[PDB]
Symmetry: D5
Subunit: 167 residues, 10 copies
Amino acid sequence: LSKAKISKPAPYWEGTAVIDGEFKELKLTDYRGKYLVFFFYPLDFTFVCPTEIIAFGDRLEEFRSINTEVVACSVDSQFTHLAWINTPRRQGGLGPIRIPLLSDLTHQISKDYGVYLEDSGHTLRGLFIIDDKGILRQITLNDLPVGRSVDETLRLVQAFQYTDKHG
Amino acid sequence: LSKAKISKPAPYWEGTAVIDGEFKELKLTDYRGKYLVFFFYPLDFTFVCPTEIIAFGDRLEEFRSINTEVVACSVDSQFTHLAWINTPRRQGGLGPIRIPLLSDLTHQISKDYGVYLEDSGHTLRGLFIIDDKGILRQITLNDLPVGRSVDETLRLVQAFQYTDKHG
Amino acid sequence: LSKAKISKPAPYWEGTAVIDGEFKELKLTDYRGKYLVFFFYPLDFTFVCPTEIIAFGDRLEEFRSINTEVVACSVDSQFTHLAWINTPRRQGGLGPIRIPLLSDLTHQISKDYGVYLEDSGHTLRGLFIIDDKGILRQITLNDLPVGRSVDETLRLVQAFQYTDKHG
Amino acid sequence: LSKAKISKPAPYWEGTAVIDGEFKELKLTDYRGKYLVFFFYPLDFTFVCPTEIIAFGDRLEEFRSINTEVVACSVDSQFTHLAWINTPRRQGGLGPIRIPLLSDLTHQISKDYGVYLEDSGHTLRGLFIIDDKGILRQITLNDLPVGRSVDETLRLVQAFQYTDKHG
Amino acid sequence: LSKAKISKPAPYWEGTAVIDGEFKELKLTDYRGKYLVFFFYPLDFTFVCPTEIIAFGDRLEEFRSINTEVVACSVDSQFTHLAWINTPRRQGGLGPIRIPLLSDLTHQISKDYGVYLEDSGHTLRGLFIIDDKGILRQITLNDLPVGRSVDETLRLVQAFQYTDKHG
Amino acid sequence: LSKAKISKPAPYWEGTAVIDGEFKELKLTDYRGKYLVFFFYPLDFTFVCPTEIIAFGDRLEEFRSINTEVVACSVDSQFTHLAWINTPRRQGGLGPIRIPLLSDLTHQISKDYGVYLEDSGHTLRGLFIIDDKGILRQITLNDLPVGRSVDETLRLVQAFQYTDKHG
Amino acid sequence: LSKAKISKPAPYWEGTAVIDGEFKELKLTDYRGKYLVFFFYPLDFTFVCPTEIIAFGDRLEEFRSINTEVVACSVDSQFTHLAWINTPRRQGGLGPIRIPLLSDLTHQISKDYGVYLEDSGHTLRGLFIIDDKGILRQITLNDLPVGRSVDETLRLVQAFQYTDKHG
Amino acid sequence: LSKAKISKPAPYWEGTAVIDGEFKELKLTDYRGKYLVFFFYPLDFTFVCPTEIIAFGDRLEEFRSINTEVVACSVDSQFTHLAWINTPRRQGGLGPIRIPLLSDLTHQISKDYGVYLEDSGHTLRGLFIIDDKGILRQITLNDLPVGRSVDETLRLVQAFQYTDKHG
Amino acid sequence: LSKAKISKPAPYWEGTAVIDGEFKELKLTDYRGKYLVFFFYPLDFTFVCPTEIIAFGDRLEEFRSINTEVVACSVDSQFTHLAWINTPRRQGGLGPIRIPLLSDLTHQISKDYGVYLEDSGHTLRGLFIIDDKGILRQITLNDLPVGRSVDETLRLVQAFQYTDKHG
Amino acid sequence: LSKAKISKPAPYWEGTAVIDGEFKELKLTDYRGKYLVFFFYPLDFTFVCPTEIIAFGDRLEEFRSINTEVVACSVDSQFTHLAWINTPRRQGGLGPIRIPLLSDLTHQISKDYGVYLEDSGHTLRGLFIIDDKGILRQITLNDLPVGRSVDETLRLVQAFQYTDKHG
């Protein structure tokens, strides 16, 4: 059963992420004081260019300049994430990336967030906006075929921040 | 608990809607053969301009030109919906509108779509994209202070229709 | 199930009421030391003139001069109550009113009083007489098509007060 | 628990009544095709004048002329009812009466109608209005010290009949 | 279910009795230190002469002279008991009587003693002999058509007292 | 629990009885068409003369001449009943007897009649009057020290027969 | 169900026994410090000579000379046991006997030792050897037609006592 | 739970036995038409001479000449039984033997017969006499230290056979 | 909980494998008529040389020449397996391989074989030998730091085939 | 159900073993501080040469020189193990042996290790490698016809010790 509810604390997670090419333990609470865009994608190493992850990474400062961080997550192992990062974009790899890739190998994070697909063994395309107090503000769930927009994500983050300030 | 699951038939609903200023019985199955943008908003007659509903109403041909209908819903009675429509926009009303306003007075529809707020008695801001075969493709849930984008909604419908065709 | 039982404390309620054009928190316990006539009606903004609510409001001093207050309640939001108050009587509205209009948006009050209609999402016409000690003395439940009498209500209040004094 | 619910069939009853000084088997269904005013009172042979039963008997033709019957019930035996009737009014009795007095000796009718007082062994003052199709239309429950009004009962019956015919 | 068991404490009872034409609170425990003959009969005001109650009243001194009291009970109200007593014997009444008449209006005493007839709402003819320590010594249950004997009751009470003293 | 209920079929029993010095199978149904006095006593061979059983046997024609039979029962074996019968009265035995002595060695009959004492392993003194149709009409339960009266038993049988005829 | 298990304390029992023609309270714990042969037989006063009980009685010194007591038990009352003892052997009695005859009138002892016959109401032929520390050492159960041997019982006691000493 | 009850069919068993030095499947039903002495002993290959098994085997014709067979059983495997039979008596072995040695390796037979010792993993010394119709007639359970007598077993078999014939 | 039991059908599995650089559906029953060595390893793309997989790949003809196939499985996706195969050995890839790599992305195969590590989200090193009838013959489970031996695997397979043919 | 789990404490066992021709109590924790190879085999005294046990016995110094002990276990009693050891190899015995033979007569050790065959009453061929801290490192289960390899067992032990020391 999903733990993710709007206006309640975002469900706690921890696990191993690849950050600047290294394995680091990462925890939701590491982001307190900041907004967090926390998003899931199905699988590393598929035959489709990972356009949506590349967009977030390549535009990361439009988030960081407004006190917002981004973390991407799939059910792949941290070893697979690293191998994918070390595969050049021109071979369909991710290439070097400035966003943590969190591993959800046990599937517990995906199940807690309601994005796990039992019959397939990976997630759908789920995106969560979590405020600086750790409260879940937004849930976006897409069927597999359709990606997320950085511009829409920024719009939502900027609006939650505006409304936090001018209540 | 919520019955809305991506890739499954969207939860059936029926109720009274205000359409072109008249009460009409409306059913989810009335939309079979078309895409449907089905969204919830909290309450009629609040002190905030209904910008988002006005936007979908002004830009409705952009959906209809791609075989897509739009339905809005709140927990308000059909009588309240009709009064809000009949209240001019400059007096805090909605004014004439081209999108059906569905009443979920029993709260069953809101509960089935996972958008009902037990402590408040109305919905959060939830939007669902349902395809022409009645299958749920997309779920967007926003905390109360933040509205929806017609552009983003349009991009998602177009992308689902594209991937349906060339999938 | 209904908690309203003759000779027991009337079930506690609290919510937002419209009182002289403003939102106020109102509680049952605010009425200790006075008799209270507490009545439900189905919906704001219907096509029938609200004759029964108008009568209680317009004859309110016949209650106040015998240490009795009146509170009307429906499942409509406080925003809808306010819009209805601000709709002139000769356009079908309530117009200005002296009696509080309590919102039961969550349906919990209506359920506690055994007046909620599950299939419709609103109440029947229920009226309750509560004494100055908070004890329920009288229950009147009418099917939808038939309203209440101010004169019968006064007879009942006067009889309970008389028997309280000379029992 | 009470089976009496507005808009549902009134709970079936049968038992022995005193009608014109004779024991008769009486059933709720005997009244199909007519409105019925069915009321309970606590006990025979108390030291209070039975004003309300006398008023209903005195004014019975105002009910029969609008296709309505009246039945009174208490938990007393039929033998008690008959003795009370046979006791002159000045001597603490009811005297002759044209309203059936139904015995609820088993207490089952009083429990089904939600008027039984478990700590006392008799009912409070409950009155019920049942239509010609056997559907419950109105529930009135009074704490012991306050009686019912023939005029109010007539107003209710006339309104239900008018709305049945004219909507 | 019945709580009356030979050699166990007789089930506790309390209620309102008519004693010498007055309402009095009566308790089983009021009789500690004496034997008690406690009997039930079905109903007041039937068309049968109440021969057995009259016989017990007529011969009461044969009990009091051996430290024994007698109490009669039916499901009728205390108000019924008083009216029956106040109705002359030739006129269908009991007339004046020196035995308390206990009301079991709630039916709880009759159920505890196993004498209640659920389909009728009154008791069969049960008689119980309770010693000075409050211990049940004897149960006599008769189907409705056959009464009790004062002589047999005296024989039983005298035998219990003789065996209590002489073994 | 006891199956013996006034106005219902007396509980079925069968067992081995001593009848005129011989073991015979005896069943309740053997007595259809006659009234039956069926009574239990605690134990054979105690130090008290069996006066009550002797009285019923010695006065048996006062029952037989009014179409009534008598059966005595205890928990003793049929072998013990026979030895007791073969013990002269002036040595404390029963001597020859005309009434069957039923054995309830398993305790099932005693339990069915609600006369079994769990702590002692025998019955109290219980007596039952059963009509010619097999219906239980009367129950008499005495604590151990006090016996039954042939004369009271005849009065009861005669009363039930009289009311059966002229009810 | 049976509580008798080899190597565990023999199930506790107590009851009234006939010892030297007098009633005595007897308990299993009275035998602590001695071996005990505890055996059951079906019924007193049958038409079979009580050969086996007579044998244990005639040869009782052979047990007492090796610190061993013998107790016999049936479901018969102590009163029946005493009568059977007082009946001369030539008239189908037991005659004077040196072994206590324990009564198991409630059947609890038989049930605890696993020897009770539910369909018959008495025991089969069961024999138990209990050591001086109260532990059950041997269980012998015989269908009704076959008796026990004193010699065999003696061999078992002697063998248990031998192995106790040189174990 | 033990299935072995006197007067009921002996619990069914089957398994591998050593018979004349060979493995044979053996079943309780193989013995229909004959009495069977069926006995358990703890373990093969202990340091005590198997005197009691040797006695049964060496005196086997005192059983077979009266239509009676003997089977011995332990929890040892059939391989261990065979190895034991092939160990000479002068080395504490069984030597050649004419009685089947049944293996109860799974423990199901021992548990069905109530002879299994959970803490030890083998049986106690249990012996069962089963008649020619397969009915259990006798149960003998000995604590470990004490053996069975062939002479007692013959006495019991001869008595069941005598009583089967002269009922 | 594990379904894998020696001498029972090996648990059914199906999924996507990489075979000669392509995705192919594969199921357990594809191997009916052949022996199957089915083994799990923790993870692709780790920092330890995949020596054991390379060893089975290199020596695959020693299996095929004795009617035996080999399948390897981890929890990694098929896409990851393909990427790992397409990574040269000199960069910590597997390189070209002749053994199918099965994906257990859902973890259901691993759980069914009892090799899944709930705290880690991958398997330990389990190896299973399944015969040509689909029956499980051998289970080998190694803690993570220790690998499997092709020589020991071949010994086992040959011994099962030898014992299948020669009893 | 099996308690044996890789990386968890090996299930505790205790019982009687034969060590150098004598009975000794043995428990798992006697081996703390050493590696233990713990293995089960089906049965003593079967017709197949005990080659694998002889092999571990013969090569025991290869284990002891790497701080490792070896214990073999079957369901046979200790007495049977001793008899099997005392039977010369040339007659299908084990002969002298340096490995403890543990008895699992109760079958509880076998069940705890998941090696027990309920239909047969003995184990399959299971082998367990337990480290010096008592943690289970390896499980090998073979169907009955195939034995274990000392060489593979030594490879595993050495690899666990190597990986324990060098990470």
